[PDB]
Amino acid sequence: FRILFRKLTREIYRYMQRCIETDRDFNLNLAVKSTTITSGLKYSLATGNWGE
DNA sequence: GGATTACACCCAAGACACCAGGCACGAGACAGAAAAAAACAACGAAAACGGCCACCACCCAAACACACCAAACACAAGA
Incomplete structure (x- = not known):
């Protein structure tokens, strides 16, 4: 679980790198790919x- | 630094890539590199002032001689 959750948090960082550029509010329910x-x-x- | 570590047979169980930055094309800016001009070196032409021969007179150099001093064989002394 530690391995997989560090994977997930890296995904969250990789996503907030892109989406924040758009300068929009985001609800974080499209930011977590739960399937990992x-x-x-x-x-x-x-x-x-x-x-x- | 690699390379090898029994032989045969049976059964079950999961996967049979997804997703993210590079090539092409897709357009700006200083750097990779090219064009020019103005203060850089020299040379031609005129001006007059520094340089060369006279003229010149007073100050340093040579001769004469002075007295003075340094010096050198030897008659005498001496161990």
């Missing part, structure tokens, strides 16, 4: 390979 942690946990528990 879900897909990672599911991949590890379904394959056994413990990691990205």
Whole structure:
């Protein structure tokens, strides 16, 4: 979970780099790609390979 | 620095890339580089003042001699 959540926070940074340039208010519900942690946990528990 | 580490067989389970900066084209600005002109060096022409030979007179150089001093064989002294 630590690995996958640092992935997610890096995505949030990469997104706030672009969207903020537009100079708009953003609701953060399009800023988090929730599928990263879900897909990672599911991949590890379904394959056994413990990691990205 | 690499390279190799038993042989045969059975079963199950998941994936069979997604997403992000570079090539082309897509347009500005100082730098990669090109054109010019004005204060840089020299040379031609005129002006008059510094340079060369006279003229010149007083100050330093040579001769004469003075007395004075430094000096050198040797008759005498001496160990």
